Amino acid sequence: EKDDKDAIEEKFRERLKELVVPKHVMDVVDEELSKLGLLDNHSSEFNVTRNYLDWLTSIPWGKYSNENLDLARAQAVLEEDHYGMEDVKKRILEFIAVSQLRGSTQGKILCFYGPPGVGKTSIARSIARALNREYFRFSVGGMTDVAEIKGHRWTYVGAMPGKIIQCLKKTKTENPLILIDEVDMI
Amino acid sequence: EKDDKDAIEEKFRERLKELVVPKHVMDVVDEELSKLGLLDNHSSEFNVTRNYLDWLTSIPWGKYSNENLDLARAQAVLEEDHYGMEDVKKRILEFIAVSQLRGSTQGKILCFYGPPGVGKTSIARSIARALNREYFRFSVGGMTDVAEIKGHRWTYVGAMPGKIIQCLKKTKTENPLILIDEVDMIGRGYQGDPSSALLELLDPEQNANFLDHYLDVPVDLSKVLFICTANVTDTIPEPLRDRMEMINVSGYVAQEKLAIAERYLVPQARALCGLDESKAKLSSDVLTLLIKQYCRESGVRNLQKQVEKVLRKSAYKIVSGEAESVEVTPENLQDFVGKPVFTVERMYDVTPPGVVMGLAWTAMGGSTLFVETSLRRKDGSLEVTGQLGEVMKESARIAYTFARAFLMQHAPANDYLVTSHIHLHVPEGATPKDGPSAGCTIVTALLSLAMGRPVRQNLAMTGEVSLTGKILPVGGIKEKTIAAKRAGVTCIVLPAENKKDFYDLAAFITEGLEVHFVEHYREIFDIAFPD
Amino acid sequence: EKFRERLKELVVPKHVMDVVDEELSKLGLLDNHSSEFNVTRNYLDWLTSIPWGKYSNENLDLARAQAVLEEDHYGMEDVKKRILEFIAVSQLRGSTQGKILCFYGPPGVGKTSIARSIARALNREYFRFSVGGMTDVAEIKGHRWTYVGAMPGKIIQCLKKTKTENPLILIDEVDMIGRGYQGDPSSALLELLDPEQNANFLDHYLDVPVDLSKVLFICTANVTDTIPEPLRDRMEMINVSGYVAQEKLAIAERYLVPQARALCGLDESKAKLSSDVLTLLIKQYCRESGVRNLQKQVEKVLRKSAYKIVSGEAESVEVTPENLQDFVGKPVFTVERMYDVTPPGVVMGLAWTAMGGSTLFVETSLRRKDGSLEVTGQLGEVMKESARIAYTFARAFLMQHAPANDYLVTSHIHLHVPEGATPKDGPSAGCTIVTALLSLAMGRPVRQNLAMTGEVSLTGKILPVGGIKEKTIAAKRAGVTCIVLPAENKKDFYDLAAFITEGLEVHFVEHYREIFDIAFPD
Ligand SMILES: Nc1ncnc2c1ncn2[C@@H]1O[C@H](COP(=O)(O)OP(=O)(O)O)[C@@H](O)[C@H]1O
Ligand SMILES: Nc1ncnc2c1ncn2[C@@H]1O[C@H](COP(=O)(O)OP(=O)(O)O)[C@@H](O)[C@H]1O
Ligand SMILES: Nc1ncnc2c1ncn2[C@@H]1O[C@H](COP(=O)(O)OP(=O)(O)O)[C@@H](O)[C@H]1O
């Protein structure tokens, strides 16, 4: 039992050891830990238990991404990357400046509506370079399902989880940059 | 247990050590390796983990099928294997030249759009071998399952990754050519969005770092040549449409078809059966008769079938020894496929008053569609038929108005359109955006009807007309002009803005066809009804 | 050793042996105590049971194969012709060959039965499979072995049971293949119709590629149009025809009568049945091209006869026309054409239907400044639009011929057309519709026993219709005297065998002004 059950348990714990994890989360995963040892090895429910347990530990907690927040460099990067778009340039350098003065990270929602092929998306990447924030992309155009974001219940077979967590699983950090596109064609 | 565990682990070791493996993969595999060492043999996880090892080792990390750079040899393979397709041959030569400057592998995303049975599928098969890539065919069609592409979740026992990963298991090359079919005929499902899954492939940035639900590893596909096929352009989703370059793969006229049939169709049909040239001989004239009278397709799928059947009846004869050894001639072909299917190409010989033969780029390809009008005994009316979209309805209204408008300006003594109830029919098949294309044709019909002077014999015309009578450019001149030629037209009338497109065609296509270009409808009236 | 008993004799390909030996080695390492040991044993058994290198010895002796088809079924020359190509071609290949052949036609015509005959002729394993309204892919692609109650696909089950890689697959009723929650079954079917995927087909249970090419796939349809487009383009088409009474007569006598006797085990002398009895059995008990009706009726007579013989109240069974009521009672269908004399505003039409060749009427009536038409029936958009064209053509036409009459232009008309005609064959009754409205106009009815079809343009050019073969069968069965077809349908008409087309006064037309001069005397 120590060969299979404990191996799964251990590998996930020393993964989570470096993460600043909230109290409510430990109680969930510890219950899952107790379940894994309790449940039969070859059962389908074991696989689901092991499935849920894996996702819980994989997701980062309190792993705040760092940034240089040198404003001179930031403006230089954006000017080197694109011509025009001073307005969006102005806004985002204001955002870094605001964040800088607060002496802390900030999470706000911004939108660029523009005609197609104008450079909204490419700017997104320029922001990530300037901001040292990890990048991610997700489209909602022609989309009619809550369950790809809100997730399916982990009880179900063939359950497809939330999109957002996959990003967080990809990034392995907080303070991400998410581009959400075709929001008007939802 | 431990001795036997090592041998299980070592068979994967030898597989991976021959590949140019990314750093993260070894860290993944070692973690999987470390689990297997402690995991008991009977364990379900042990089997899946070992299964997972097979999948990742099957991936050709840094395995490129050596792509050879020879302008002449690339051409030679394409030249012998396929007829024509100048545009596509040039685009494929272009792909060689770019790859040459790199001195390394290259990847790209293209579409082959055209009428069915014109060889789209066949061309791509030739590219792979020509460029020394492993060929693959994959089908999206109306598939709604997103998991076909992105795979299933790894943790589920017995689950498998996406079929493109499975392709790399078979092909053992990081540089394959993947053909994806009928992307225009995309399916819609609750389960997921296949469109977005494919958009991960078509987006160049996402392509370099593609992920699977089972594999959990970022793979590189930037060097993979993706090849799309479609029948029509508009039905392709917008994000897919604009992350990819479209190439028009045209239909064939008589002469092209005939060379296809003689050089390829006939030896493919002979190789399919196993016959010899000494056993089964057709003729140039035979195939001319077969093409003209026993096929109506823009492509050659249908003529391929008719050639096929001919050799099949010949095959039977030889085994049994029923007749003398088969030479096929027009007189005795009747025994092979039967009586002439089509005796006439079009709906009339000569158009009566108020009927115009118009042109239309159908979904399938080129065709002629006649337009016809009718009278019923204070303000006049128009009734319209076919599955006319709201768009065309409006256009027809404008056409109707323009027609009326033109009548007062020209012959104010007459009163026809304006005080009589009129019905015209427009046959369907024309795509949404191609619908307005027969606007000016409607106009012709209403005017034709008015004076009762018929449209002059075997004249065609296509275009959109504004409310004051200005003609707009129309799409797909290639297709409409093929169609006119097939249906035995003599004289054609086109927008002045389409002058570019018409003179891009080959010699044998445009010849025998006295073309006119026009910009406004007052020009057209002087053509269609001289005196 | 037990597994090896299959593997030693059945010569196994490379990649399969690789899975087998891995599974076999796993079985040896795994404890027999465990449940997963049995999973391996079940999995291994499946792999060994599946044939490898036992292709059936293809008897390409053409002369013998000819005879087998000819004796088993009556007519069917076209279908046999296609099959006899198949052997001949296979001879030039010098090996087994794989192809996909479609028998569309009316029910009870002999599609299933003929399939049996080919299997006999080619000495292939007759396997029968049914999609019908199939909604699930797991029937083909199997269910994943990890799930509870998992069983591989019937295609996989077929190979195990037949013990050969050269079977014949009957897959009937593909034209109306169902759709459901799990997706489109048609996708899995495309995997069967493509030889490219046949060589490398895999199952969720089997998990091993298998070459199922070189296999004759046979599918049946009822209507061509309803078959999915990707399957249809890939598919090869064979028409399988209907039959007239005289044809049906021969079928009963040679086949159905002895077949019923064979099934009942009754001697021919015991239960005598005559030709005249069946002549009445057709005219009075059947009105469709299928012999399902006639087959059930012969069964009924002989089933009663069996009782008669055993019990001994009539230990000699002989059937005459005056004694038929003893076994089947009174005639079910007393009349054939439901208008004997057509009144004004009524005309006889023709249609192609799923159930087969059909016979339908068309009628119009009044309702009481502009006129109106109310088309009725479960009619589609196309037919509605076509009717507008028909109605407009009617209008057009009347001013031309006799301008003084203002009936149809001013008054309000109600029109009815019976259903059954496929959307594709929906417009075919267009021509008849016009006939009805003009008939309604002068109130002079159409000339007696006249059936007629065709699409009509807004200006009155007629167009060709599909499935004329079945249409003409039905018009014969309903006993029309005269038939008017489109001039471009002349091809189909002369393609027909002479015995069906006997006594039909056929006329060929390009434009409706010809119809009007034929359907009305002066
Ligand atoms: N300000 C800019 N300076 C230079 N190139 C630009 C600029 N804005 C856009 N582009 C170009 O636009 C393209 C990307 O457009 P994209 O962001 O995908 O369009 P959209 O805004 O519709 O999403 C790139 O090829 C990029 O070079
Ligand atoms: N230019 C050409 N050269 C050689 N073969 C051709 C050419 N055009 C058409 N064909 C033939 O016509 C057929 C078209 O089939 P396919 O390419 O599968 O259809 P589709 O283009 O609809 O995918 C092939 O069998 C191919 O050999
Ligand atoms: N032309 C024919 N010759 C001989 N038997 C026939 C013929 N047509 C039908 N039958 C009889 O029909 C019976 C069953 O028909 P079946 O194959 O079920 O028709 P379908 O496939 O159209 O439903 C067979 O047992 C056969 O004897």
Residue numbers in the entry:
A (entry chain C): 410 to 595
B (entry chain D): 410 to 786, 796 to 949
C (entry chain E): 419 to 786, 796 to 949
Structure paper excerpt:
The hexameric, barrel-forming, AAA+ protease Lon is critical for maintaining mitochondrial matrix protein homeostasis. A human Lon monomer contains a mitochondrial targeting sequence, a Lon-associated N-terminal (LAN) domain, an α-helical neck region, an AAA+ domain, and a protease domain (PD) in a single chain. The LAN domains specifically recognize and capture fully or partially unfolded substrates, which are then threaded towards the barrel chamber for degradation using the chemical energy from ATP hydrolysis. We determined high-resolution structures of substrate-engaged, substrate-trapped, and substrate-free forms of the human mitochondrial Lon protease.
